[PDB]
């Protein structure tokens, strides 16, 4: 059985690992199937914020992530959705 990550709109296979953002923190999750085991990680703010529409930039393990506001999603919150 697979795990669904709604923030990415994608399923993950067992043991697969991905990132899931909160407003002020990043969580890394592993699929156990169908439930994911997550661990909240301490994240620093990116020096440069490439996120659009008020996206919060969270940097962890090198690369940057965008926690998008409602009505926006994608790698840089450049997709209009639920607003
Ligand atoms: Cl499936
Ligand atoms: Ho929208
Ligand atoms: Ho809209």
From Swiss-Prot:
Disulphide bond pairs: 3-31, 29-38, 46-57, 51-66, 68-77
Location of the Fibronectin type-I domain: 1-41
Effect on the protein upon substituting residue 10 to P: In FA12D; CRM-negative phenotype; low levels of accumulation in the cell; not secreted
EGF-like domain residues: 42-78
Protein name: Coagulation factor XIIa heavy chain
Originating organism: Homo sapiens
């Amino acid at each position: 059985e697979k795990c669904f990550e709604p923030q990415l709109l994608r399923f993950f296979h067992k043991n697969e690992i991905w990132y899931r953002t909160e407003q002020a923190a990043v969580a890394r999750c592993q699929c156990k199937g169908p439930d994911a085991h997550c661990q909240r990680l301490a994240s620093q703010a990116c020096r440069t914020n490439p996120c659009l529409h008020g996206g919060r930039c969270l940097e962890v393990e090198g690369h940057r992530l965008c926690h998008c506001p409602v009505g926006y999603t994608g790698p840089f919150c450049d997709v209009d959705t639920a607003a």
